[PDB]
């Protein structure tokens, strides 16, 4: 706050008001930056499940290796997390702790999906289009920008009919 002195610095050794270790580097915000989520708690709504993936992924790694329940339940985990598309691959088991990020589940968000498909120019313009009521996922026009869309639902996002932005393209 002050560009404080050489004599001030050594006395205020451990203090900070901007980057804290309980504030965990403001890492969440950098994901709230890159994916433009409205509320903060959407991050911790993913990150409260994201450890819950690992909390099952860890203790299923603690079973004996050719336990015939263990390889079956892990396949049931991985086909589920591959249907929702939150990991790129499913062949390895190691993505269940390495690829399960908040950004990976957060790049399965709806404006990320439209932002990939280049219906929109930027990310936030797709959020503005969902807010304007221009988009639909198969049957239903969705109002919410924070839609978790699976891999198999990804073909169902179109523009909504009779709009002013579907005639724009």
């Amino acid at each position: 706050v002050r560009k404080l002195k050489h004599h001030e610095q050594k006395l205020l050794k451990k203090v900070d008001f901007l980057e804290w270790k309980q504030d965990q580097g403001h890492r969440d915000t950098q994901v709230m930056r890159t994916y433009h989520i409205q509320n903060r708690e959407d991050y911790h709504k993913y990150n409260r499940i994201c450890g819950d993936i690992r909390r099952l992924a860890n203790k299923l790694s603690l079973l004996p290796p050719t336990d015939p329940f263990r390889r079956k339940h892990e396949q049931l985990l991985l086909d589920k997390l591959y249907a929702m598309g939150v990991l790129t691959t499913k062949s390895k088991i190691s993505d269940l702790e390495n690829k399960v990020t908040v950004s990976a589940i957060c790049r399965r968000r709806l404006p990320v999906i439209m932002h990939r498909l280049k219906m929109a120019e930027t990310i936030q313009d797709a959020v503005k289009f969902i807010e304007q009521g221009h988009v639909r996922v198969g049957p239903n026009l969705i109002n919410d920008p924070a839609y978790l869309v699976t891999r198999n639902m990804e073909d169902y996002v179109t523009w909504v009919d009779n709009s002013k932005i579907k005639k724009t393209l």
Binding site: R2, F17, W20, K21, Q22, D23, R40
Partner: protein, 385 residues
């Protein structure tokens, strides 16, 4: 003693027939000087929830928190307003921690630490409930008592948790920090206020303050007398220096929502549709026992010094401006500053707090205080031990 340049305002009856408490605030606003009469604000912001109030320790910035979404930091004396945040989570309290640049709000789940402009600085992973969010700048310690049994101390200088103390008392129904001692006072449903230091995992001393739950508690500037109210329509006048309730005001018409203490010795009791302040009620005699009605006008029996009744409200909390003679009462639609004659002190010490402070004076004083912070083990039952 004669260097003291400014003297308190008074309120005098001038007759036995004329009465002190019967003055009303529009009637007060006639004779008070124009800036001081205009320092009474009427912020009716009826759209959001009931409003929580806190002035900073210098009166320079007001912070308010409506129950629904409002977070508002005005540079209160001038027209400037720093922060106006609409978080759709519900909030309970707020305080500036060091200066008006940094404050903290008590939400549904997590405490937030915030810039003057309204930006997000620090969401606390801990503080998972936050009912009372109070500060002591002499340790730079944000002490927070939620609905949990615990009590959390965050040292926002370093930005780290100091300690977390489970009371086994349940939901915190009141908390007032001691200015003179930095011992925290927590009030719970048994009628029990516990004194607290971050080191000692058992409380410093528990006090069976009243029956029923603790409505609120409020402490002197001198730390001598702390006025506690239960929900049993009762208010005790605790003398902390020897741990005695001096007077037990029993059978209020309604239990006071809050209590507040001015500098010069005023006591504020807010039953919620009514706000009533007594002068010199904290003294030793039961003649100084604060009482609602003295029959026959006896000087021994003590009448209230200043009265007010809110019509369409049940007010939330209240706090004096520490250097001026008003008190912000947060009602359901907003904020009134009710003008007292002699509540605040007339002669502040600038080297303790600056009510008239340049921003460059502010960044000098902030670094001055951060150099003079105490580490948390120095919170003790006596300052001088």
């Amino acid at each position: 003693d004669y260097l003291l340049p400014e003297s308190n305002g008074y309120l005098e009856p001038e007759n036995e027939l004329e009465k002190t408490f019967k003055v009303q605030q529009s009637e007060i606003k006639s004779s008070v000087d124009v800036s001081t009469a205009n320092k009474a604000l009427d912020l009716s912001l009826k759209e959001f929830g009931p409003y929580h109030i806190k002035y900073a320790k210098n009166g320079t910035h007001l912070l308010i928190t409506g129950r629904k979404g409002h977070v508002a930091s005005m540079d209160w004396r001038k027209g400037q307003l720093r922060a106006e945040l609409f978080l759709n989570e519900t909030c309970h309290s707020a305080t500036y921690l060091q200066n008006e640049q940094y404050f903290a709000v008590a939400q549904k789940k997590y405490t937030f630490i915030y810039d003057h402009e309204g930006t997000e600085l620090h969401r606390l992973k801990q503080h998972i409930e936050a009912r009372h969010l109070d500060f002591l700048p002499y340790h730079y310690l944000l002490v927070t008592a939620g609905e949990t049994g615990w009590l959390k101390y965050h040292d926002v200088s370093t930005g780290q948790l100091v300690s977390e103390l489970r009371t086994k008392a349940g939901p915190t129904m009141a908390m007032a920090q001691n200015p003179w001692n930095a011992v925290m006072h927590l009030g719970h449903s048994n009628g029990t206020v516990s004194l607290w230091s971050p080191s000692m995992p058992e409380p410093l001393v528990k006090l069976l303050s009243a029956r029923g739950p603790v409505n609120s508690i409020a402490i002197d500037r001198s730390g001598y007398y702390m006025a506690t109210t239960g929900a049993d329509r009762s208010m005790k006048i605790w003398d902390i220096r020897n741990f005695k309730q001096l007077h037990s005001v029993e059978s209020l018409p309604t239990p006071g929502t809050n209590v507040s203490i001015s500098d010069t010795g005023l006591l504020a009791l807010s039953r919620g549709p009514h706000v009533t302040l007594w002068k010199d009620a904290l003294k030793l005699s039961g003649d100084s026992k604060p009482c609602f009605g003295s029959m026959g006008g006896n000087p021994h029996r003590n009448t209230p010094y200043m009265s007010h009744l809110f019509a369409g409200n049940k007010v939330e909390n209240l706090g004096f401006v520490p250097f001026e003679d008003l008190l912000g009462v947060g009602h359901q639609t907003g904020i009134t500053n009710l003008i007292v004659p002699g509540a605040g002190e007339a002669n502040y010490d600038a080297l303790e707090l600056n009510p008239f402070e340049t921003k460059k004076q502010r960044q000098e004083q902030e670094v001055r205080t951060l150099l003079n912070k105490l580490p948390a083990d120095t919170i003790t039952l006596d300052p001088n031990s």
